[PDB]
Write a protein that binds this ligand. Structure first.
Ligand code: FDE
Ligand code: FDE
Lengths: 450, 452
């Protein structure tokens, strides 16, 4: 039962200066590489422990001892998402209520309903790229969020953002980035009440009104369908017989627009990066897509058969998990790993990109992109691969993402050949999530019609 | 016949508490009363209470020899900032009867003639706000009603001007007060009060207590500068029974109590009164007939307000359907049997479900859900204890004369100066803090172009 490592302190500022970058998650990974499986991290008022090894995280994922915690990041995001599924505490009224009301919308059969609409937007993406003249290129992260925002909008709410009819980023997304960017910058503000932050605070509200105005436009377009929005309005709580409060329903819409398109958007962009940097892996998935997608538009069953594309997807999110961390707190007093005592209420952070690079589980080539590690999904021991959270607070849209990413990635491989014409150097922008910045490619159409 | 009491589904050691995990508990209890009848038991971990809905038993609960006002768990939570004020006091406490005798003079008929000028001040400000809206704009009723009623309690009670109509967003006192009242209501439904989910709530609650006290510190200090209003009786008056004036801790509680109770239920009341009228245009047209008839001066006099009797009936039929203070609690002085059927031990508590009492078919007929102001044309015809929107007995509402005069004046001038359009076909949505208000009620107002 020994003492815990800790990085450099700056007097009364503690460890806060060490995350004084636009890339805090990558700075924590360096500290993890420098200090190991666990280290203590102090801020003016907060203290947290970062876990990097599967040995300690395996006990942290035990729901008998640990419960989902709202990190200082989520408490700031709660300023515009409120008590929706992502930023809710487990033991507060609306998490249980809404979790059970929304869960039918993510069943395997609900996915069959989404498929036609997912195919709608994916065809729009293929048609955008097929109409590029020979000199033009593609901005990967921008066209992916065009697609992922449109999917969550059409399937969830029957609302058309028409992102492909906008050369500019969609206004909802542009202020959302600023709101998520603001939240992350507040984690680095020592004294958030300095007058210097008065422009920053007023812009922050300006961006929330933009997010709420769109939601009221989504609500006004309804009040003919059995989508996710019908379920928010109509589902009863079995114990009380009542539907979700209107203020919560606005909160869940925001949550799904954000969590339901950004992490999928980063995902697809990373998968395209690793393919275009590993050209043999790209032709093996291109062979599978040419084999399985035999129709002008894909069917639901065909997506289920793109086994190798799926492994590409799992190996990308292993290397770069687009939601990079989740937080826990100590239900009751306990000792961690038989060496580290924790009092009730002590907080842990699972550093997901560090868990997925644990040499002791994945072998001594953790940093290489090898999709063939997931040819045997069962081989990997429990709690070693945690890109979607843990337990009852794990990602509810866990199958929706996989189907959307697989379908979209499948059709791109069927219809285009991709050249990394600039020799792109991977640069990971951090909002609270991860995405490659300025990643561009060229796509020669294989001239297969739709 | 002595009989066992109805009780809805139980959820283990949580008892009946899961049933009220909603944003609108009073309308949920009206659903339970509708299905289990005139009385049911409701259990929570530490507490037990029985909810009454029918006049036959509620007239029995209104017997002051057997039952005395009880502080429900909701009132005990408000006591965290209302303290020893009139509303959160036990009848047997030293500071209830003391403060009651000191402040009751301020709500007399003789005081009412003095307030009339100040009420007109606020009311004219509201009229002028609506006359200066551009053609496309609309009116959010509860927000402008709180602007009116709060400015009224400030000026009439403390000679203090909140200037709520010179503000775009709510007054900061109003936001901190509602968040405090919202907290108090939500602590009632909460299973595990030490869960980390509630640290922000405890923080924010304390943040909201300091702002309400700071504002009271501004009112008290602003007088040490400078009258014969309610605050003068608080500071200078002495109790006629004991010859003691009020404790300085207690005076701070009385100012808070009157800021809350002296504007919140009147603003909801007017909002509902305006709601039912845009929904019954024959009733609305009849009420503007009387206001155009009686209010012949640019501003109304005290005598003219007392001559608006149909407008008053509109207000009474409004508050029957939606009593903005929806319940009050009682406890049993001694062991007694209620209705000859339900035995109660000494100290057991009761709750009066006022919107259900006002929905008794045995008293009001088979159209209790219809908005008919003409039930109040015959003042004597109502049975006793059938209409209890202002509490009971010695703990009844001290300002019901005050509220009625304020509400009737404002409702009267609105009818004289405007035509009201329900341009959205507004669907009634009743937000619950601990009181009742319509939430998103909006209307448009055509100026009748009558000068002031
Ligand atoms: C719609 C959608 C879509 C999606 C996607 C995704 C991707 C790609 C990735 C991801 C992730 C994730 N998620 Fe995700 N997602 C979603 C969602 C969600 C929600 C709602 C949540 C929360 C849940 C609960 O709690 O209930 C999540 C969730 C999630 C998580 C966890 C959180 C915490 O904090 O714990 C993670 C890690 N997600 N994700
Ligand atoms: C100033 C003012 C104004 C007013 C108004 C009103 C309206 C509109 C309604 C109402 C109500 C009421 N209230 Fe009212 N109000 C007031 C007040 C008051 C007070 C102070 C009280 C307490 C009394 C004794 O107890 O002493 C009341 C009170 C009252 C009541 C009772 C409570 C109990 O718990 O019992 C009720 C129900 N209120 N309200």
């Amino acid at each position: 039962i020994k003492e815990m490592p800790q990085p450099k302190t700056f007097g009364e500022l503690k460890n806060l200066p060490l995350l004084n970058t636009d890339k805090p998650v990558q700075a924590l990974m360096k500290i993890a590489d420098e200090l190991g499986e666990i280290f203590k991290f102090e801020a003016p008022g907060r203290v947290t422990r970062y876990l990097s090894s599967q040995r300690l995280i395996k006990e942290a994922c035990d729901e008998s001892r640990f419960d989902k915690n709202l990190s200082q990041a989520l408490k700031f995001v709660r300023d515009f998402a409120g008590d929706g599924l992502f930023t809710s505490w487990t033991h507060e009224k609306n998490w249980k209520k809404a979790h059970n009301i929304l869960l039918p919308s993510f069943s395997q059969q609900a996915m069959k309903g989404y498929h036609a609409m997912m195919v709608d937007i994916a065809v729009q993406l293929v048609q955008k790229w097929e109409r590029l003249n020979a000199d033009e290129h593609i901005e990967v992260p921008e066209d992916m969020t065009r697609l992922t925002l449109d999917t969550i909008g059409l399937c969830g709410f029957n609302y058309r953002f028409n992102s492909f009819y906008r050369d500019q980023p969609h206004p909802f997304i542009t202020s959302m980035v600023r709101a998520l960017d603001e939240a992350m910058n507040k984690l680095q503000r020592a004294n958030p009440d300095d007058p210097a932050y008065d422009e920053n605070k007023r812009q922050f509200q300006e961006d929330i009104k933009v997010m709420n105005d769109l939601v009221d436009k989504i609500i006004a377009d309804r009040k003919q369908s059995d989508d996710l929005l019908t379920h928010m309005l109509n589902g009863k709580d079995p114990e009380t017989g009542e539907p979700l409060d209107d203020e919560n329903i606005r909160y869940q819409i925001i949550t799904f627009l954000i969590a339901g398109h950004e992490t999928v958007s980063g995902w697809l962009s990373f998968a395209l990066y690793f393919l275009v940097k590993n050209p043999h892996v790209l032709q093996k998935a291109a062979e599978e897509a040419a084999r399985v997608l035999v129709d002008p538009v894909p069917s639901y069953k065909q997506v289920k058969q793109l086994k190798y594309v799926g492994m590409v997807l799992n190996e990308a999110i292993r290397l770069w998990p687009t939601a990079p961390a989740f937080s826990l707190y100590a239900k009751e007093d306990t000792v961690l790993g038989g060496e580290y005592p924790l009092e009730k209420g002590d907080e842990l952070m699972v550093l997901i990109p560090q868990l997925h690079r644990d040499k002791t589980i994945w072998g001594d080539d953790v940093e290489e992109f090898r999709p063939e590690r997931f040819e045997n999904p069962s081989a990997i021991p429990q709690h070693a691969f945690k890109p979607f959270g843990n337990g009852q607070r794990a990602c509810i849209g866990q199958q929706f993402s996989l189907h959307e990413a697989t379908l979209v990635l499948g059709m791109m491989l069927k219809h285009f050949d991709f050249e990394d014409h600039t020799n792109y150097e991977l640069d990971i922008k951090e909002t609270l999530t991860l995405k490659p910045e300025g990643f561009v490619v060229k796509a020669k159409s294989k001239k297969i019609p739709l």
